[PDB]
């Protein structure tokens, strides 16, 4: 589930639907995604 | 126009001989025109 | 008043960028000397206070220092970003000012580097001073230290060239009694860059030390009269700034200089002009020249900067016909809004599709 | 007053009329044809008879014009192989060109090589400008609406029209000021 | 992450190094410098 | 394969051997134009 969520988030962040798709915003989006992934936490109560 | 055609060509196209974007060329043209108007264009017009 | 606002404008221009693009427009009086040439004593005597820490061979000054000469309610020194008035009379206040200057120099210099592009701004106020801005730069070196950056000399040369790029930059050359006029690297560089020398005025310091070193009085007379320097300077004045040691007070050095001026071994020989004494006329002429040149520079810049802004706006509009100005704040806000919209869209997806995708993938 | 009016004369910057667009196209075409004729005259002065004119006699040949013809052919082949080339010439490019020329037994000074390269570059950009004018003659549909996926950016026509209208405004202002002041001044001088 | 980025302009300067960002910053700095110089000119004219 | 051996099949071609064949042809033409050449290769010759 976590891997699927990460894949969906990455696809949403990098969605070159537009003909330009400037990479200046893309780099910031990827950095924010990586920071959120590293900062994400999980609860053992949910696992139980 | 017949008098200043050569001057305009040699003062605009000669420096901007490798411009690719039309916006940069237009900006250079505007800068050159403003500089000419400020420096000696009224004097040349009066002499002509 | 005008001098304080001009100093603030110069500080803003310096803080605009670490390079030298618009900083070379307004005139800036820069004082450049040689290493271990006694320029520290001359600079201290100019401000009538010991504010520059002494260095036993080591190059203490590693960052540019701005000295703004002005007059205020008290003879104190105040920085642009400081609120403590460092008095120029009490020894404790002078020591505190030197410690603060050293701390600022260390902060600018990186841990491993030698020359830092960051500049230090200092405003000097007090009665008896003129209205001008003095810039201090590290001395020109020749050898390369193996324990430091190999490009330190190249960086110093580039900084000196950038500072000299200003057509109205007044250069104050400082020499030593044991250093000849031709031995001064700064003087030779000024002569090479300005063969005419119509804006550079040579100032001779530590005349007594040079005289005591069995020097030829003919050379001193020629230097004072101006029969040796190819440049046509506006004048030549010889002053004594003490022995250059670190045990003579400012008042003692001033009294010694006054006594030497009153009774000199060269004035009694009728070989020096009577109108080339003291420094009041030279200071007034320098101040008037600086004021007129800065007035001309600001008159030109009042239109030059407007033209530059118009050209920049035209370039921005032409490169981005469908996009307006996008600074850090607006772009960050737009990115935050886009992230919020993406999160909203993610939360708005039908759970059934998520369940189907997860089941199929698993 | 003339300086102020010249600075203020920046009113119109775009063409919204088909007839005005066609007039600007025709004026630009006339100017470019005049420039092309001047360039052809300069090239003929530098070299002489070319193609049919040179081969009409079939028995008149000169080593000086033969060298120029060979350089022109080499530059044309280089453009055919490499349409886009920087205006400046690097050292290795000059060395390669000189070696290619000397392979068949032709030695040319670098100054003449640079001059011929500059002339060929100017001719190539004149041809490119002519092609751009031909495209813009039908590209008014793209120009008027400014489509996102535009296949043609007509800016020289707009620039030339702006220059023409600014010149017309300046001439009108000059005529007015002349009639206001200089006619009276000349009349006073004649009377005196 | 957004709050940390907002509370640290040095990170924004280090990351947002695009041509548009630099051009906008230069234009803003030039405008501020020109406004300060105009204020200086006005103050000098009023004092004299 | 070279010459008759290479062209006997007329349908077997490899990019690696084609490059070698082109280099051999170029060197043969250079020798035909310049019979005498130093063994070493200068930088300008290699660049050309
Ligand atoms: C639907 C298919 C979706 C595929 C999904 C994959 C993907 O992401 O591609 C999307 C991609 C385009 O996005 P879309 O939103 O699906 O459709 C928009 C089209 O541009 C709209 O169609 P269009 O044909 O009007 O496209 C614009 C037009 C632009 O007009 C032009 O300038 C003409 C250019 C094309 C000329 C034709 C090519 C040159 C002559 C050779 C003709 C060969 C024909 C061969 C026939 C078949 C042979 C068996 O021509 C093209 O660019 C051709 C697009 C065909 C590829 O889909 C296609 O693969 C083409 C769909 C159109 C047919």
Curated annotation (Swiss-Prot), chain A:
So what does mutating residue 11 to A actually do?
In interface mutant 1a; strongly decreased ability to mediate mitochondrial fusion
Say which domain of life the source belongs to: Eukaryota
Subcellular localization is given as: Mitochondrion intermembrane space
Function of the molecule: Constitutes the soluble short form (S-OPA1) generated by cleavage by OMA1, which plays a central role in mitochondrial inner membrane fusion and cristae morphology. The transmembrane long form (L-OPA1) and the S-OPA1 form higher-order helical assemblies that coordinate the fusion of mitochondrial inner membranes. Inner membrane-anchored L-OPA1 molecules initiate membrane remodeling by recruiting soluble S-OPA1 to rapidly polymerize into a flexible cylindrical scaffold encaging the mitochondrial inner membrane.
State the name under which the record lists this protein: Dynamin-like GTPase OPA1, short form
Question: Which species is this UniProt entry from?
Answer: Homo sapiens (Human)
Curated annotation (Swiss-Prot), chain E:
Per the record, the coiled-coil ranges are: 1-48
| Region of the whole protein represented | 913 to 960 of 960
* Record's function text: Constitutes the soluble short form (S-OPA1) generated by cleavage by OMA1, which plays a central role in mitochondrial inner membrane fusion and cristae morphology. The transmembrane long form (L-OPA1) and the S-OPA1 form higher-order helical assemblies that coordinate the fusion of mitochondrial inner membranes. Inner membrane-anchored L-OPA1 molecules initiate membrane remodeling by recruiting soluble S-OPA1 to rapidly polymerize into a flexible cylindrical scaffold encaging the mitochondrial inner membrane.
Protein's UniProt name: Dynamin-like GTPase OPA1, short form
Q: Where in the cell is it found?
A: Mitochondrion intermembrane space
From Swiss-Prot, chain F:
Query: Where can this protein be found?
Result: Mitochondrion intermembrane space
What does changing residue 4 to E do? Answer: Abolished ability to bind and bend membranes
The entry's stated outcome for residue 11 to E is: Decreased ability to mediate mitochondrial fusion
Name the intramembrane ranges. 3-13
What's this chain's function?
Constitutes the soluble short form (S-OPA1) generated by cleavage by OMA1, which plays a central role in mitochondrial inner membrane fusion and cristae morphology. The transmembrane long form (L-OPA1) and the S-OPA1 form higher-order helical assemblies that coordinate the fusion of mitochondrial inner membranes. Inner membrane-anchored L-OPA1 molecules initiate membrane remodeling by recruiting soluble S-OPA1 to rapidly polymerize into a flexible cylindrical scaffold encaging the mitochondrial inner membrane.
Q: What is this protein called?
A: Dynamin-like GTPase OPA1, short form
| Gene symbol of the encoding locus | OPA1
């Amino acid at each position: 589930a976590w891997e699927t969520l990460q894949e969906e988030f990455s696809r949403f962040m990098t969605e070159p639907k537009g003909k330009e798709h400037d990479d200046i915003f893309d780099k910031l989006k990827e950095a924010v995604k990586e920071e959120s992934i590293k900062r994400h936490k999980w609860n053992d109560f949910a696992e139980d | 126009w017949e008098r200043v055609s050569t001057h305009v060509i040699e003062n605009i196209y000669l420096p901007a001989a490798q411009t690719m974007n039309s916006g940069t060329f237009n900006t250079t043209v505007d800068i050159k025109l403003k500089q000419w108007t400020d420096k000696q264009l009224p004097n040349k017009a009066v002499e002509v | 008043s005008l001098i304080d606002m001009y100093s603030e404008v110069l500080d803003v221009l310096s803080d605009y960028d670490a390079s030298y693009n618009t900083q070379d427009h307004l005139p800036r009086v820069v004082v450049v000397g040689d290493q271990s040439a006694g320029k520290t004593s001359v600079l201290e005597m100019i401000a009538q206070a010991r504010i520059f820490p002494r260095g036993s061979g080591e190059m203490m000054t590693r960052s540019p220092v701005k000295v703004t000469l002005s007059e205020g309610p008290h003879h104190v020194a105040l920085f642009k970003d400081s609120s403590r008035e460092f008095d120029l009379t009490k020894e404790e206040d002078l020591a505190a000012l030197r410690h603060e200057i050293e701390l600022r120099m260390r902060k600018n210099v990186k841990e491993g580097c030698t020359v830092s592009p960051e500049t230090i701004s200092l405003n000097v106020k007090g009665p008896g001073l003129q209205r001008m801005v003095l810039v201090d730069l590290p001395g020109v070196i020749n050898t390369v230290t193996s324990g430091m950056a190999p490009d330190t000399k190249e960086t110093i040369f580039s900084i000196s060239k950038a500072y000299m790029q200003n057509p109205n930059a007044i250069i104050l050359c400082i020499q030593d009694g044991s250093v000849d006029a031709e031995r001064s690297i700064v003087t030779d560089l000024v002569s090479q860059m300005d063969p005419h020398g119509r804006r550079t005025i040579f100032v001779l310091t530590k005349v007594d030390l040079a005289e005591k070193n069995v020097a030829s009085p003919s050379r001193i007379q020629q230097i004072i009269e101006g029969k040796l320097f190819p440049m046509k300077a506006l004048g030549y004045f010889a002053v004594v700034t003490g022995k250059g040691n670190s045990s003579e007070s400012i008042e003692a050095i001033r009294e010694y200089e006054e006594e030497f001026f009153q009774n000199s071994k060269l004035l009694k020989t009728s070989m020096l002009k009577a109108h080339q004494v003291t420094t009041r006329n030279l200071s007034l002429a320098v101040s008037d020249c600086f004021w007129k040149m800065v007035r001309e520079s600001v008159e030109q810049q009042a239109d030059s900067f407007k033209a530059t802004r118009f050209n920049l706006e035209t370039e921005w509009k032409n490169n981005y016909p469908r996009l307006r100005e996008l600074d850090r704040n607006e772009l960050f806000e737009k990115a935050k809004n886009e992230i919020l919209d993406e999160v909203i869209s993610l939360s708005q997806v039908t759970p059934k599709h998520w369940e189907e995708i997860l089941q199929q993938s698993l | 007053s003339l300086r102020v009016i010249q600075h203020n004369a920046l009113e119109d910057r775009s063409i919204s009329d088909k007839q005005q667009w066609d007039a600007a196209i025709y004026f630009m075409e006339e100017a470019l044809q005049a420039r092309l004729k001047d360039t052809e005259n300069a090239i003929e002065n530098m070299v002489g008879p070319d193609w049919k004119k040179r081969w009409l006699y079939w028995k008149n040949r000169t080593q000086e014009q033969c060298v120029h013809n060979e350089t022109k052919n080499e530059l044309e082949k280089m453009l055919k192989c490499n349409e886009e080339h920087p205006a400046y010439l690097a050292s290795d490019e000059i060395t390669t060109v000189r070696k290619n020329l000397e392979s068949r037994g032709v030695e040319v000074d670098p100054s003449l090589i640079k001059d011929t390269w500059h002339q060929v570059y100017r001719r190539h950009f004149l041809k490119t400008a002519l092609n751009h004018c031909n495209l813009c003659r039908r590209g008014f549909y793209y120009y008027q609406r400014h489509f996102v996926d535009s296949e043609l950016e007509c800016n020289d026509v707009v620039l030339f029209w702006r220059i023409q209208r600014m010149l017309a405004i300046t001439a009108n202002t000059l005529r007015q000021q002349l009639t206001n002041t200089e006619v009276r001044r000349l009349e006073k001088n004649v009377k005196e | 992450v957004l709050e940390d980025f907002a509370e640290d302009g040095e990170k924004k300067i280090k990351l947002l190094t695009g041509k548009r960002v630099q051009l906008a910053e230069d234009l803003k700095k030039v405008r501020e410098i020109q406004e300060k110089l105009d204020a200086f000119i006005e103050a000098l004219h009023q004092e004299k």
